[model samples]
Target: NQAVLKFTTEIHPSCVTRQKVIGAGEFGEVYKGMLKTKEVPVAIKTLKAGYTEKQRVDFLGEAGIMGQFSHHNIIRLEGVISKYKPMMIITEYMENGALDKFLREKDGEFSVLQLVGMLRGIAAGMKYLANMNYVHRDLAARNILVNSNLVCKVSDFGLSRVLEDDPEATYTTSGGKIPIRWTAPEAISYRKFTSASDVWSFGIVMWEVMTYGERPYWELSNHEVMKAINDGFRLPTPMDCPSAIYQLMMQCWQQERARRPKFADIVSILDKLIRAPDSLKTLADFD
Candidate 1:
């Protein structure tokens, strides 16, 4: 049944009230709201009216998929308000908001180990999803949500997919511009998205984290990015990135999907890096 999700995942519209505007999404307005039960803080995304049937399913797609997953590193779905008009998807409010913007505002204040901890958290989350045969098509820093305690949770599921049918399936979409800057070349060429491609995106995120959120490729447009990737040009090492971590990023960016390390392996590398803080002192060698 399409309605097989838990009833507890439903909320009465009256039980939620917008406290203030938090941000606006492609679907509609997002708000920092209070769930009336004992006044818990939550973020709510409303599906703006005048939407098509396509919009409704797409809007609720992530919400339902989110309810199926449970992990500390994954964004939790508080519930949904689907029984009424102006449907809402309620999620836990992240005090620090998006990770990219959050780190950009930090001004290189965080230690490499602290940033590694964030990346490790994201890798663990993706490992969890990978174990469940779910591929997160969008796994960038911008999609990561951070709380006041500096805990980073993987968020935004609009482009994610469950691949229970095929673990190595190369899902080629009908028609859409792949997220060039963060997408793997194989995925860009044929829309052949797999968890391996997700690994590629994570590599890009590694560069983002090390550079304190510098835009990928700096001045290259999307077309330029695609050209560079096809011409065998990968992102340059971030100025202060550790040698070992950059090595791991290079492994993730391997042109052949099979060459890239799995999320499980990535986690192991991070654990080693985090365990021995001195390992991050060596700078990556480059031209």
Candidate 2:
């Protein structure tokens, strides 16, 4: 059925003209483009020709999932062009690009309150997905996008999975690539994914925000990270990071998935922090 939609929404090659090559995406090259339907700028995700079957499935699958989302904090899917060569998935152009890269380039120009606002936006987006019973397995800072107005929106759904109506609400992958750095312990050990696992990834994202896109957690190797996490070690608070925000990250990293705060709770906590800037002054120091 989705394969059929891929063919039907195909935009003519002539109608869409690719501009600058923006960056390398999960599938292939992403580009700045213009469509006749609207003269406004757009982002086009293109798959290289002669791609394998698995690649096609993942690329189109992202478009299908993104098309169903309609939130201000979720990247908007414009359309797709897969009937002909140079297949493309069009979406709203995010001028600043990925959240991590955007923050890195800013060189900590944003105040702590502003950074918390960005995290709030991400949590609200995740809350939206959670409400719809969706689990974003790859809920990391790198998977998020920043628009011209500095608004953050969740993106990159290639690894996202939908859950059944079960209390466990877990989806186990048969076998595929896993993001060790951002993944929860259970997700890495057992391949079990749920909203709770996503909360764990969001904790890493919080670290990224506080450190301005520094390396994951403690800069440990994948093997060391797993072993360290299994031994009950969590990332220390980033330099000068607010105590309140780091506390929230620690809650998200609770060993038990059930104990992790939900995205709704995360949003509320950030809201309170934002409302009271004085609380953001308490710096966290491991030393």
Candidate 3:
């Protein structure tokens, strides 16, 4: 059973018309394009026509991952056009595109409440994934998509795997590469990736949001991040970020993986922060 085939829908290649090249993806270029005679805008992932058997399979494999998840905070995959010259995977158009690039382009624009609301949605998205026993091993601000309404959805399923044995247990990586900055120390060192590790990734994502998408460790070196994190290097609060939100970020980065707050708890804390905007009045402090 191409059980994933159960969720994927087949569409005619003629149904889509490429409009503009909006971005690029691992397997192909992305387009802000048109679909349907009714003419709905869609994000089209046009896979490279020249590909190996495994590459083609893996490219469409993302469709399998995106299709299974259903949550308000998760991006929606519309359908696939595979039986054509250039295969394509279509998804709901996110007018604002990736969260990181959007924040970078619109720096110093959004209100504090607006920023927190976006983060809250990301956390909720992860919470849904957490509850569903899926580990989005590549969680990052760049992987999150923001629509025209500024509602953010966790996305990019290229590096995800399901936890079939225990919904709460760790997932071992069958990996060749990993995202060092957006990854937890333990995951880097031991390969014991859990939702806790994802929370650590979320912390970097929070920093990325607060700082308008600055590179995770601006003073960069993959080796440096690994060494520093092992010995307790943590990100400083972004200028003007609310201390309460930074507190949550720090909790997410805790060395004791068990101490990291669950995505559900993170959603609750962020909900409190959103419910009472006054609660975020205090700016961050350094030790």
Candidate 4:
């Protein structure tokens, strides 16, 4: 069954009862809904109808892969409805919404402890994917969602790919609109999307999270930021970001991929912040 949009109202697929529209993007509309199977509230992401065969294949492929990821910090895929004209992905509803928006609502007011917990959760999910040999091509604040507990769940694996051993197994997207600010320098120039590239994106996302959703150099235009970065412009420390945390971000963004810390290293660094919650306090109190 396909969701139908009539006037301002939406009717979800047979397995879901539409509650309200949550969001919309170029790809599709997201709605809060109730699932018939689990009798639980969930989110229904309805992709535009009449998808090309290629699009259908890609959509289903993502659903299949996501369906297998069973980590606490990774958003779980309940099921998907790919019948008939419209296709929809069913996922657990995230009431708090995007991580960046949640933090920005406070204007970078989150305590350092809170920030550490959130980052830890994100890294946990990333580590899981990395262990599976999967690289999330689009790891950013916008794609991370939070639940009521402030636990961050990594979402939107639309651009994720399972990395292989072949050096030539590279992928070249139709040169999609590059996430210029968050993209690694090498990935920006060549389409060499790799796990290391994801580490670079993770570093940029940390900057965005610390700065309360402020884009990478929000002052500079996309073109200017790209040129500046390509020419060696790096992000500055936040008002109260910890020296160690700042150093971690720098290591992630290092020019040499191999120089970047492994996922395990990232987890360890963040875990210490979790244990000694006061460490984050120093940075927060500085605010």
Please give the TM-score that candidate 1 achieves against the real structure: 0.91
Write down the TM-score of every candidate: 0.91, 0.89, 0.91, 0.84
Considering only N, C-alpha and C atoms within 3 Å, which residue pairs clash in candidate 1? none
> What is candidate 3's lDDT per residue for 177-228, written digit by digit as tens?
5777888888877787888899999999999999999998887677777788
Error of 3 at 208 (Å): 0.5
Model 4: worst 10 consecutive residues (lDDT sum): 1-10
Clashes of each: 0, 0, 0, 0
lDDT of each: 0.82, 0.82, 0.83, 0.75
Best-to-worst order by lDDT is 3, 1, 2, 4
Top model by lDDT, which number?
A: 3
Off by over 4 Å in 2: 3-10, 25-27, 159-176
Candidate 3 to truth, TM: 0.91
Model 1, poorest ten-residue lDDT window?
160-169
lDDT (tens digit, per residue) of candidate 4 on 1-287:
12211111122467678789888765568899898764988887776876666666666666776776889999988777765446787888888998877878978567766776788888889999999888887788888998888889988765432222112123334454466677777877776777888889889888888777886787787668768877777788877787677788889988888999888889999998778866665542232
Error of 1 at 173 (Å): 14
The clash tally of candidate 1 reads 0
1-287: candidate 2 lDDT, tens digit per residue: 37435433556778888899988744468899887774868899888788878667767777877877789899988788878867888988999988888878887698888899999999999999989887888787777999888899998775432222111233334453567778888888887888999999999999999889887855576778778889998888887799899999999999999999999999999998899889899988856
C-alpha RMSD of each candidate structure in angstroms: 4.5, 5.0, 4.8, 7.0
* Model 4, C-alpha of 95: deviation from truth (Å): 0.7
Give the clashing pairs for model 4.
none
